[PDB]
Amino acid sequence: WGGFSVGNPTLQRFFALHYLMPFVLAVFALLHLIALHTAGSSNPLGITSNVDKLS
Amino acid sequence: VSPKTRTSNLKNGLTIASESNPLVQTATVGVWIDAGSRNENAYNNGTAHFFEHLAFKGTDKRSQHQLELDIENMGGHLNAYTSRESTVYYAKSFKDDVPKSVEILADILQHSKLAESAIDREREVITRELEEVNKQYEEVVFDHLHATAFMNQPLGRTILGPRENIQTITNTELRKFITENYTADRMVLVGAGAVDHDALVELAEKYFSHLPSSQSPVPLGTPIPNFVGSEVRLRDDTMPVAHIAIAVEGVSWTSEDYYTALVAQAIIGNYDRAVGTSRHQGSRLSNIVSENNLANSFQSFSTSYSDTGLWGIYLTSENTTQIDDLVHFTLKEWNRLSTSVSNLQVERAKSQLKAGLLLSLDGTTYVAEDIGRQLTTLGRRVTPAEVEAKLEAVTEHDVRAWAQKTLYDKDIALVGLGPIEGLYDYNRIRNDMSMMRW
Numbered sequence: 001w002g003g004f005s006v007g008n009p010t011l012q013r014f015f016a017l018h019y020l021m022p023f024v025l026a027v028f029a030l031l032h033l034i035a036l037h038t039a040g041s042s043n044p045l046g047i048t049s050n051v052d053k054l055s
Numbered sequence: 056v057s058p059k060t061r062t063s064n065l066k067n068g069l070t071i072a073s074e075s076n077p078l079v080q081t082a083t084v085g086v087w088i089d090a091g092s093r094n095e096n097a098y099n100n101g102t103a104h105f106f107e108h109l110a111f112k113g114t115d116k117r118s119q120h121q122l123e124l125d126i127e128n129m130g131g132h133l134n135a136y137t138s139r140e141s142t143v144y145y146a147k148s149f150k151d152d153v154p155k156s157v158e159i160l161a162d163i164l165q166h167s168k169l170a171e172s173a174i175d176r177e178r179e180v181i182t183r184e185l186e187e188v189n190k191q192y193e194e195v196v197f198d199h200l201h202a203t204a205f206m207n208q209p210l211g212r213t214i215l216g217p218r219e220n221i222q223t224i225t226n227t228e229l230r231k232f233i234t235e236n237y238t239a240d241r242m243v244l245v246g247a248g249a250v251d252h253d254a255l256v257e258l259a260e261k262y263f264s265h266l267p268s269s270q271s272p273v274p275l276g277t278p279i280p281n282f283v284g285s286e287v288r289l290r291d292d293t294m295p296v297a298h299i300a301i302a303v304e305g306v307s308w309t310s311e312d313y314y315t316a317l318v319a320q321a322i323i324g325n326y327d328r329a330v331g332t333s334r335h336q337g338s339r340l341s342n343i344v345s346e347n348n349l350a351n352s353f354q355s356f357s358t359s360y361s362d363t364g365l366w367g368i369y370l371t372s373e374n375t376t377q378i379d380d381l382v383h384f385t386l387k388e389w390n391r392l393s394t395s396v397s398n399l400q401v402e403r404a405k406s407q408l409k410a411g412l413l414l415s416l417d418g419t420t421y422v423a424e425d426i427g428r429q430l431t432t433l434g435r436r437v438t439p440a441e442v443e444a445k446l447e448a449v450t451e452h453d454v455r456a457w458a459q460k461t462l463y464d465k466d467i468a469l470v471g472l473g474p475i476e477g478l479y480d481y482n483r484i485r486n487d488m489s490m491m492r493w
C-alpha cells in the first residue's frame with residue numbers, strides 16, 4: 001500500500017505497474033509461442049499433422 | 056537455302072509432299088495422319104494405340120513373320136507413333152528400296168488382318184505397358200498434366216487408354232476406327248532425302264489410290280477445350296528427384312500468337328546442370344537456378360494442338376528444401392514477361408530462334424517429320440523465308456501484350472511427382488502468377 005490503507009501511494013504505484021504489466025504479458029505471450037513452435041499447433045483430431053501441412 | 060518442298064494431290068485427296076537431298080543416300084518415306092487418340096470417345100479410348108501394335112502383326116498377304124522378313128531384306132527399318140492429334144508410320148531405307156517401303160506401308164495401313172488371336176495376344180503386352188510407363192517420369196508428369204488441364208475432355212485422355220478398354224477392344228471397333236479416321240483427305244505421304252517427287256507420286260497412285268475419302272472433307276489441321284486450373288500431386292518420398300510441370304493454356308498451331316509464344320518460351324529457355332555451357336546462358340532463370348543449385352534441369356515448352364495448347368515449364372530437382380524457391384523464381388521470371396521485358400530480351404530470343412527452327416531439321420527423319428507435321432497442322436509447308444518474316448514481326452511489345460493476357464494472374468495446371476513436400480499448396484503457387492509491386 002505504501003501506507004496504512006489504500007490511498008494515494010497505492011494508486012500511483014498501481015498506475016506504474018498497470019502500465020508495465022502488459023509489456024511483461026506480451027513477452028510471455030511471445031515465449032509461449034516460441035515454445036509451441038517446436039511441436040507446432042495441435043489439431044482437433046489429436047493426431048500428428050506432419051503428414052498434411054498448410055501455410 | 057534448302058530445296059523447295061514439292062506437293063501434289065491424288066484424286067481421292069491424298070497429299071504427297073517431298074523434299075529431295077542429293078547429298079544423302081537414305082530416304083525417309085511415310086504417312087502422316089491427321090488423327091490420333093483425341094478422335095476416340097471414352098469407350099474406345101486406347102484404340103489408336105492398339106492399332107499401332109496390330110499394324111505390325113500381319114496383313115492379308117504377308118504374315119507376321121513374312122512382314123518381319125520383308126523389312127529385314129529391305130535393310131532399313133519401320134517406325135510408328137500415335138499421339139493425341141497425329142499418327143505417323145514411316146520407313147527409313149536406302150535410295151532404291153523406296154518402292155518396297157511404300158508398298159509395305161500401304162499394305163499394313165489398308166490391308167491389316169486384325170485377327171482375334173493377335174488382338175488377344177497384344178491385349179497382354181499393352182496391359183504390361185500400363186505398369187512400365189510408371190518409370191518414365193517425364194511422361195507420367197505430362198500425361199497427368201493433360202488429364203488435369205483438360206479435365207474430362209478428349210485432350211485429357213491418355214493414349215494407352217484405361218485398363219478396362221484394353222480388355223474389351225474388338226477387331227470390329229479397331230476396323231471402325233481406322234475406316235472413319237484413316238481417310239485420304241487426312242493423310243499425307245511424305246518423302247525426304249534421296250527421293251524423286253515424281254517417282255513418289257507414281258508409287259502413291261499405285262498403292263494408295265483405293266483409299267476411302269471422308270464424307271465431309273475439311274482442310275488438313277482442322278479441329279472446344281476449356282482449360283481447368285488445377286493440380287495433381289503424386290508425392291513419393293522414396294524418389295530422390297522431384298519432377299514438376301507448370302502450364303497455362305497456350306496457343307494453337309494457327310494462332311496469331313504462335314510465334315509470340317515461341318519467343319516468350321525462348322526468353323525463359325532450358326537449363327541442364329550436366330551440360331557445360333548451361334551455367335553461362337543469358338536467361339535470367341538459368342542464372343538464378345545455376346547459382347543457387349535450385350534444379351538439375353528445366354525445359355520450357357509451348358505445345359500446340361489444333362484448337363488449344365499448353366505453355367509452361369518442366370523442372371527436375373534434388374533440392375527438396377528449396378522447391379519453394381525454384382518455383383518462386385520461375386514464376387517471377389514469367390511475371391517479367393508481362394512487366395519488364397524489352398527489346399533486349401526479345402531481340403536476343405529472336406536471334407536464337409531464327410537459327411533454332413532451322414537447326415532442328417538435321418536428318419531425313421527430322422525433315423520428314425517437319426514436312427508431315429506442318430502439312431497435317433497448317434495444310435502447307437511454311438518456307439524458311441516466311442518463318443523468318445513471322446519471327447521478325449514479333450516485337451517486345453507483342454510479347455508483353457501476349458504475356459499479360461496469357462500468363463499474368465492466370466490459372467495454372469500443376470503436376471508434382473516425387474519428394475514434393477516442399478511444393479506449397481495451389482494458392483501460394485498461383486499467387487506468384489502476379490506481382491503486387493506492379
Ligand code: HEM
Pocket residue numbers: 025029032033036040041042043
Ligand atoms: C495474452 C494471452 C495469449 C495470447 C495472445 C495467446 C496466443 C496464442 C496463439 C496465437 C496461439 C496459436 C494459435 C491458437 O492455437 O490459438 C496459442 C496457442 C496456445 N496457447 Fe495461447 N495465448 C495466450 C494465452 C494463453 C494462456 C492463458 C494459455 C494457457 C493457460 C495458453 C496456452 C496455449 C497453448 C497450450 C497453445 C497451443 C494450442 C494448440 O495449438 O494446440 N495461451 N496462443
